[PDB]
Amino acid sequence: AEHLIAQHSAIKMLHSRVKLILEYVKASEAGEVPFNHEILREAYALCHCLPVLSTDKFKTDFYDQCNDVGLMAYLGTITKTCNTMNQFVNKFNVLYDRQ
Amino acid sequence: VVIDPTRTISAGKVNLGAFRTYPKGYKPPDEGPSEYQTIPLNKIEDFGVHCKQYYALEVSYFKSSLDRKLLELLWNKYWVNTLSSSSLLTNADYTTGQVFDLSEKLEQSEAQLGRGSEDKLAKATRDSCKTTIEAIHGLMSQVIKDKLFNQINI
Amino acid sequence: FSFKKLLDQCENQELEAPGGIATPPVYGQLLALYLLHNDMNNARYLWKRIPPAIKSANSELGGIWSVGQRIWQRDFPGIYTTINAHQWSETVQPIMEALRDATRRRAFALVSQAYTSIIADDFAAFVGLPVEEAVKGILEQGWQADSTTRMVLPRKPEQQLARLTDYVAFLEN
Amino acid sequence: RQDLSAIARTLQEWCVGCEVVLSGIEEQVSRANQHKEQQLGLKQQIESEVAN
Amino acid sequence: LVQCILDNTIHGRIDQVNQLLELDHQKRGGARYTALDKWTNQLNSLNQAVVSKLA
Amino acid sequence: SALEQFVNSVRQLSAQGQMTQLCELINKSGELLAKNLSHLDTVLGALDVQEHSLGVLAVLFVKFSMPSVPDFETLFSQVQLFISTCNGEHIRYATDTFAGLCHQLTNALVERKQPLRGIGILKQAIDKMQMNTNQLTSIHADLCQLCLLAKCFKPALPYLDVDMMDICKENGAYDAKHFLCYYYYGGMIYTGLKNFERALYFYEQAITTPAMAVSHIMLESYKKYILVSLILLGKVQQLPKYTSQIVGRFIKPLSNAYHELAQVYSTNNPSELRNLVNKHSETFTRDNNMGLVKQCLSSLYKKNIQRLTKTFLTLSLQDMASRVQLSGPQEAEKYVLHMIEDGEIFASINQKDGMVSFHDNPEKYNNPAMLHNIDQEMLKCIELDERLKAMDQEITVNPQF
Amino acid sequence: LISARVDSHSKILYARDVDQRSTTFEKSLLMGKEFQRRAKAMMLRAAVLRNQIHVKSP
């Protein structure tokens, strides 16, 4: 909850900028608001910058990152379950067994 | 004042403490909650020996009216840096160092169960939890970036 | 797609309708459908479950198992020969053609992975189609065909955030 | 001038994208609390059975 | 080159078929995988020792 | 006279408090019961046929004769009508006569001929005896036995695939041989479907059982354990230290041929294993596991071809035929093709030059496939931890020792 | 100590280099699988020791 709040605010800021630029585009195209060759040209240049990194090398690296964290998470969950198993057997050897 | 710059980065939260010592011979009173931190095995002995010889102060921060204004105006552009953090590889060697320690801790917790300090496995489990939780948060930021900038198309 | 639904329906009819012993056309469908999914462990134990009375009265069932023997031995040319030998319209014939197509896809996918270079006659026998038809199809697909030696050189071919939140919720509690 | 709409067609496609991501967080954060409190509550029940 | 690689003065290997020296360079983040390797080994022995308790 | 009273005493406990008196009523029943029970079953389905019908049908199967003249089919249908839509609620207290009824139905169908439909009915009874995550009831063995005789393992899997916790007793209703039979027959079911992993697991769990005397179920499960471990793994898997002493003292030297088979398997010689299979062939056919030892021979050949990947990269078919002992490059090509198809080796065939090219690189661990694999495996570990949390909580609620 | 593969067609001995990542992933995944089987086994062991299920001597 406290770790993704700075990202949520950053994304909200980005979303505002994206919405303001989009509204400028529609205002220009619909009419009334003054047409500009240069600004809409840069908005076109901004549209062509999406998606950022679609190469196969980046896909291999992104999924390498994701599998590394995934494997690490699996080993961490194994450690926690090893501890939970240890608690259970420690108590089972006292109640259901005489050591 | 003591600061851990490495854990600041990995946890995404400032890791700072302010401390004052007790005079030689003087004993602290009853109440001492002690907020838990993972201490590596090469430091834990010394930590335990001296942990009751001092106390922690309640830390808070402040800024000026101009700092307030300037930081809001800085944010109007500094948001870009939050969506381009790349925290998983900036200080990678830390998490790999912690895992090494965690492994040796687990070796000691296995030796505790062997035949026959207060439950080393639970401590090691909380350490592995913390390290993993930090790693998954890193992946969360990476996936967020992938969702925002890569999955758009023409 | 729809064959799996008919398999489940036949698997229900296997136990709901009898009296001990089930209906012979359902047995034929169940056997041929057990051959379709390549589950030979289910098919072999189904054929041995059949009483000798239906085995003598319905020889067409034995004609369906004669294909299964070849599938068990993995003799492809024999599989394509045994498929085109018996006729049992509406009941077994419409799924035998699906078996033939599935065996063709299975053999093509096997040769594309298991072989670098294979003799054109061997490949034709593996897919069941004649040599000219097979070589035409692979040249159209993109495999490297060589004449004189008669060799064919094959060419080998929230959603994420919710899971992570559940993992941290597990570790943190 | 005529094909200008296409630019907006991608800009909106990004906007909606953001609007998903944002909501996603809002939900996930909520879930992260929804678990925590629940677990605390459950612990407080276990700890209440120690007296018996 | 044989004598030199055997005495560890040159870091690399010889490709005798193509007649070249393939020098040692390929280094990545191999420190993590070794830590994860020892973590795996210790978790194996630990889970065996935890299951050993009950009977 | 007396049989006309008991029915009225069943309705008295209906929709009321305790039914322990009803358990005492089924415990006594009537001793020398008459045919009139059938007539009493004509007007008995007032609420939901009740637990009275269980006592009536249990006594009908306790008869040791008939059980309902050559018209037993009617009785069978009655039993069906008692299990299907009748079910019950207080079966948990009447488990003894319920499991007893299922055991007697199973034994009657085994003594008769084809027990196909018996499976289909039994799975309902099991479904109403167990709680939620399933309990190891005795009927679970019977089901398996039935599907082992009536060769149809397909519908018995959902009750075998679950690693169920806590054995359901309640008023006795359980014997060690039912546990042993469930794991042995279940092991044979997984062996017949060529799922050697769960098969080996099941035989292992059948051997681990604490025992003072040696049973034939344990012997046969041990023999089949060695066979499946020779098929699945390159050698015999070590049984746990908590296994019974009688296994290493009595079962081990009794099944001497199987350890002899593993001893000849370790030398990696197929002709010598063939000689040993021909030597004790009568003993292997006596145990009725001849076929699995043939799979052991084929797995030895496959092990010998799998040993070539560790040392060779590009090997001739004639060289392979000479090393693995197959006679001719044709059989080598057959074996390699089968092994690629079954996913046992990672190799390719070159017919022009007559060569086999070993690759040995299934994955680099960057697929989402691994992401999904790790997600599923992690979910399994999370499930296991939550089960352990539940067990630990359950123990914390209980009194101290 | 030789960590190589023999290419008997061309009569060339190629040195084998172990992939670090794949080996670490492989042994970790297999460890998780062995851990799960040990967990199922001890689950059933807990169940038989709880219900006192054992083979009687007579």
Swiss-Prot record, chain A:
Q: Which GO terms describe its biological process?
A: protein deneddylation; protein neddylation; regulation of protein neddylation
Q: How does it assemble?
A: Component of the CSN complex, composed of COPS1/GPS1, COPS2, COPS3, COPS4, COPS5, COPS6, COPS7 (COPS7A or COPS7B), COPS8 and COPS9 isoform 1. In the complex, it probably interacts directly with COPS2, COPS4, COPS5, COPS7 (COPS7A or COPS7B) and COPS9 isoform 1. Interacts with the translation initiation factor EIF3S6. Interacts weakly with RBX1. Directly interacts with COP1 and 14-3-3 protein sigma/SFN. Interacts with ERCC6. (Microbial infection) Interacts with the HIV-1 protein Vpr.
Q: Which family does it belong to?
A: Belongs to the peptidase M67A family. CSN6 subfamily.
Q: Which UniProt keywords are present, listed alphabetically? A: Cytoplasm, Host-virus interaction, Nucleus, Signalosome
Instruction: Work out whether the entry's keyword set contains Cytoplasm.
Output: yes
What is the name of the gene encoding this protein? COPS6
Location relative to the cell: Nucleus; Cytoplasm; Cytoplasm, Perinuclear region
In its UniProt entry, what is this protein called? COP9 signalosome complex subunit 6
Span within the parent record? 218 to 316 of 327
Q: Could you name the Gene Ontology cellular component terms for this entry?
A: COP9 signalosome; cytoplasm; cytosol; nucleoplasm; nucleus; perinuclear region of cytoplasm
Species of origin: Homo sapiens (Human)
Region Interaction with Vpr: which residues?
A: 1-99
Expression by tissue, per the entry, reads: Widely expressed.
Keyword Nucleus carried by entry: yes
From Swiss-Prot, chain D:
Which tissue types show expression of this protein? Widely expressed. Expressed at high level in brain, heart and skeletal muscle.
Question: What does the record give as the function of this protein?
Answer: Component of the COP9 signalosome complex (CSN), a complex involved in various cellular and developmental processes. The CSN complex is an essential regulator of the ubiquitin (Ubl) conjugation pathway by mediating the deneddylation of the cullin subunits of SCF-type E3 ligase complexes, leading to decrease the Ubl ligase activity of SCF-type complexes such as SCF, CSA or DDB2. The complex is also involved in phosphorylation of p53/TP53, JUN, I-kappa-B-alpha/NFKBIA, ITPK1 and IRF8/ICSBP, possibly via its association with CK2 and PKD kinases.
Annotated signal sequence range: none
**Where, if anywhere, are coiled coils annotated?**
22-52
Q: What is this protein called?
A: COP9 signalosome complex subunit 7a
Subunit-level organization: Component of the CSN complex, composed of COPS1/GPS1, COPS2, COPS3, COPS4, COPS5, COPS6, COPS7 (COPS7A or COPS7B), COPS8 and COPS9 isoform 1. In the complex, it probably interacts directly with COPS1, COPS2, COPS4, COPS5, COPS6 and COPS8. Interacts with PMF1. Interacts with the translation initiation factor EIF3S6. Interacts with CK2 and PKD. Interacts directly with ID3. (Microbial infection) Interacts with vaccinia virus protein C9L.
**Localization per Swiss-Prot or TrEMBL:** Cytoplasm; Nucleus
Curated annotation (Swiss-Prot), chain E:
Which post-translational modifications are recorded for this protein? Phosphorylated by CK2 and PKD kinases.
**Where is the protein found, in the record's own terms?**
Cytoplasm; Nucleus
Q: Which residues form a coiled coil?
A: none
Subunit details: Component of the CSN complex, composed of COPS1/GPS1, COPS2, COPS3, COPS4, COPS5, COPS6, COPS7 (COPS7A or COPS7B), COPS8 and COPS9 isoform 1. In the complex, it probably interacts directly with COPS1, COPS4, COPS5, COPS6 and COPS7 (COPS7A or COPS7B). Specifically interacts with the ligand binding domain of the thyroid receptor (TR). Does not require the presence of thyroid hormone for its interaction. Interacts with CUL1 and CUL2. Interacts with IRF8/ICSBP1 and with nuclear receptors NR2F1 and NR0B1. Interacts with NIF3L1.
Q: What does this protein do?
A: Essential component of the COP9 signalosome complex (CSN), a complex involved in various cellular and developmental processes. The CSN complex is an essential regulator of the ubiquitin (Ubl) conjugation pathway by mediating the deneddylation of the cullin subunits of SCF-type E3 ligase complexes, leading to decrease the Ubl ligase activity of SCF-type complexes such as SCF, CSA or DDB2. The complex is also involved in phosphorylation of p53/TP53, c-jun/JUN, IkappaBalpha/NFKBIA, ITPK1 and IRF8/ICSBP, possibly via its association with CK2 and PKD kinases.
| Family statement | Belongs to the CSN2 family.
Q: What is this protein called?
A: COP9 signalosome complex subunit 2
Q: Which organism is it from?
A: Homo sapiens (Human)
**Gene name linked to the record:** COPS2
Curated annotation (Swiss-Prot), chain G:
- Function in brief: Essential component of the COP9 signalosome complex (CSN), a complex involved in various cellular and developmental processes. The CSN complex is an essential regulator of the ubiquitin (Ubl) conjugation pathway by mediating the deneddylation of the cullin subunits of SCF-type E3 ligase complexes, leading to decrease the Ubl ligase activity of SCF-type complexes such as SCF, CSA or DDB2. The complex is also involved in phosphorylation of p53/TP53, c-jun/JUN, IkappaBalpha/NFKBIA, ITPK1 and IRF8/ICSBP, possibly via its association with CK2 and PKD kinases.
Stated family: Belongs to the CSN1 family.
Organism source for this protein? Answer: Homo sapiens
Instruction: Identify the segment of the full-length protein shown.
Output: 412 to 469 of 491
Q: What is known of its domains?
A: The PCI domain is necessary and sufficient for the interactions with other CSN subunits of the complex. Mediates the interaction with CAPN8. The N-terminal part (1-216), which is not required for deneddylating activity and CSN complex formation, is nevertheless essential for other aspects of CSN complex function, such as repression of c-fos/FOS expression.
Q: What is this protein called?
A: COP9 signalosome complex subunit 1
Tissue localization of expression: Widely expressed.
Task: Tell me where in this chain the PTM Phosphoserine is found.
Answer: 57
Top-rank taxon, per record:
Eukaryota
Q: Which compartment or compartments is the protein found in? A: Cytoplasm; Nucleus
